[PDB]
Ligand SMILES: COc1ccccc1/C(Br)=C(/NC(=O)c1ccc([N+](=O)[O-])cc1)C(=O)N1CCCCC1
Ligand SMILES: COc1ccccc1/C(Br)=C(/NC(=O)c1ccc([N+](=O)[O-])cc1)C(=O)N1CCCCC1
């Protein structure tokens with residue numbers, strides 16, 4: 001089955017192909033962000049905004065990917081393969097995740113629309129070749 | 141940090157611990173069940189009940205977990221520890237999803253509250269002695 | 283080209299795949315059941331519910347399929363491949379009809395929606411483990 | 425059991441005995457017609473007119489007669505009988521079918537009554553002997 | 565990514581390939597027809613309907629086909645440098661144009677919705693029993 | 704063929720030929736973006752703004768050029784069956800698209816008039832010396 005996690009929110013990975021894997025901040029940098037004004041706002045039985053409602057999944061979806069990524073470092077009798085495992089999740093999988101995460105965050109913070117209003121202004125800064133590219137990205 | 145996916149829906153793994161791991165029907169059986177009247181209604185920009193919303197992740201997290209477990213069975217040189225992955229996935233943790241999955245799924249079929257008023261029955265069904273406990277377990281009918 | 287007979291009625295073979303082929307009662311048993319309060323009400327210029335309408339074809343297509351299969355058992359010179367017809371008809375595809383048949387039939391007895399709210403139960407009945415799953419399968423009562 | 429597939433629609437095979445097997449166009453010629461403004465109008469969950477509602481059956485009723493008429497050309501160890509099979513369906517059975525099909529089609533297209541208004545004007549052109557028969561058939 | 569250049573209001577491709585592909589007049593017989601009273605009208609910086617627009621590309625896009633498909637037997641080497649050039653065009657995709665083009669054009673003659681009422685009023689008169697069917701195609 | 708697809712929108716090829724041919728991002732980068740919030744908007748039966756319609760062609764017109772660069776290596780064994788295939792494409796007669804494409808898209812999302820006024824006060828950059836011209840010339844998102 002193929003569905004777009006963003007779809008409903010009005011987004012689509014179709015435009016996330018651009019975003020360089022070095023864009024969104026490392027996972028931990030976000031995990032700490034969970035302690036924001038959002039920490040409490042989740043351990044509370046309230047749907048509120050469908051945003052977190054889903055995030056809360058990804059969180060644990062990973063909350064397990066971190067409670068299992070450790071079940072590897074222990075019960076494992078092959079000290080030559082467990083070195084090429086975490087070298088995929090925290091790298092090639094954090095990617096198709098850091099976005100999944102970061103996303104929601106940077107939407108509740110200020111506003112949803114206020115975000116798309118960027119992805120677009122970015123989805124032009126990226127394509128447009130280097131030599132033909134100003135210093136940094138937009139603002140409001 | 142710990143939390144509960146069944147929060148806003150007024151629930152906790154606590155009551156899940158009642159449900160024997162070997163209860164929720166195999167994952168696939170559920171994935172297929174997705175094709176229900178609820179399948180085609182997911183690929184729509186409308187959030188609707190958070191059940192939908194949340195559900196996606198659980199799916200993705202898996203539909204991107206499976207398309208991950210099928211990555212090891214290809215890019216692996218030690219056939220000794222190749223089969224010790226499903227010894228956790230489809231098994232040890234599969235339920236960690238089967239619970240979620242089954243949950244939402246049903247919860248969406250027969251309303252929400254109409255669900256709790258179910259898992260609560262077992263909170264006494266299983267609890268009671270086998271000598272008395274009926275043979276047929278109460279399920280969702282009408 | 284592919285389509286689904288259970289379209290306008292909000293259904294798909296998808297949910298039928300759940301129903302074990304060996305579920306729908308033998309064709310004849312159904313043909314006879316046609317003689318129900320719904321039999322005499324077919325030979326009337328009134329379309330009424332499309333169930334009726336559609337039903338006819340399924341019947342004809344068969345009542346002109348059987349009066350066809352009984353054409354081979356007469357005009358055939360190779361008794362070796364004579365019995366390898368029912369090895370598809372009354373068997374391999376008989377269900378392709380038994381499904382339709384049974385479907386409409388019932389669907390007409392206990393309303394429509396009242397039907398989906400049935401096949402959906404099994405979408406969980408069968409799905410659940412045998413150790414828990416009750417002995418008696420829920421059916422149409424009142 | 426004996427019922428008239430047309431009955432309800434206000435018709436009856438009683439008058440189709442006339443219609444020469446060479447009348448209605450070959451099956452394929454109709455299958456292609458399915459791609460008309462009717463293609464989409466069926467793969468959609470709408471009863472609309474009881475017409476197609478039934479047709480949709482015949483379609484598959486045959487849709488299977490074409491998915492089984494092929495199960496013969498493969499799993500069959502008698503290259504002398506499968507030659508006298510399709511030489512019945514696409515011939516003596518297409519007959520008691522092409523009509524079953526064609527019918528509906530030529531009813532939704534313009535109108536139902538607008539059809540019977542013909543079967544009658546035809547159910548007179550046919551009987552009436554040859555020598556005593558104009559060039560072609562009517563119109564409106 | 566798949567769409568339908570005719571469904572820009574209510575038109576499918578099926579109904580085209582459904583019709584005798586032998587029917588749609590050659591391309592040349594259409595270009596020389598474009599240069600008609602409709603040529604000096606695509607030059608204008610505006611249009612009334614999209615037909616005009618859709619047409620430009622339909623042409624431009626094509627005008628870039630030949631202005632390019634002509635490089636098959638120039639400074640190139642091969643025994644059959646023109647086996648798919650004039651073929652693939654009058655056989656596959658290339659013909660789709662003979663359909664497309666043909667379309668818009670007439671669409672500007674007696675009108676638009678006066679055409680659709682034809683495709684049908686014909687897509688049938690063709691498949692109907694050539695012996696019992698009327699002699700004249702409806703309008 | 705003597706016409707200009709930009710004329711109807713008030714534009715001439717020159718207005719791009721002088722422009723950095725190598726500017727317009729790869730056809731790829733474009734086709735991808737196209738499927739942004741416009742993808743599902745073109746499939747629909749509404750041409751609304753001609754850009755749409757005209758665009759459809761471009762795609763198709765190309766969707767057969769992509770389907771064409773595939774028959775240039777089937778049963779062909781030439782000394783250049785994949786070397787000059789993209790000599791006119793990703794360079795000459797293939798740019799006609801990069802320009803076109805890029806064009807429309809931007810317009811639909813940035814009004815129209817405000818689109819031109821951009822390139823205008825831009826096709827000047829490349830004309831203005833490096834050390835003097837302010838390294839900016841943004842695409843106003845207002
Ligand atoms: C004008 O704003 C920006 C302008 C340019 C570039 C970035 C930003 C900022 Br805002 C963001 N960075 C974070 O929010 C963010 C979220 C979480 C963590 N974290 O994981 O701790 C770190 C950074 C950001 O990604 N956006 C994108 C959507 C609209 C604007 C904000
Ligand atoms: C005035 O009309 C006609 C006058 C004389 C003879 C025939 C016709 C035409 Br109309 C018809 N032919 C098709 O519709 C038809 C349907 C489907 C296919 N097909 O399978 O593609 C081919 C032909 C036709 O059978 N009728 C009978 C009912 C009233 C008039 C139309």
Ligand SMILES: COc1ccccc1/C(Br)=C(/NC(=O)c1ccc([N+](=O)[O-])cc1)C(=O)N1CCCCC1
Pocket residue numbers: 589593594597665666669670673674678679682701703
């Ligand atoms: C007397 O009417 C006819 C009687 C029988 C058959 C066809 C026609 C004619 Br008229 C047509 N031929 C062309 O338009 C046409 C347009 C452009 C080209 N072309 O590509 O050059 C070729 C043909 C035609 O398409 N229609 C459809 C709409 C109503 C008028 C007729």
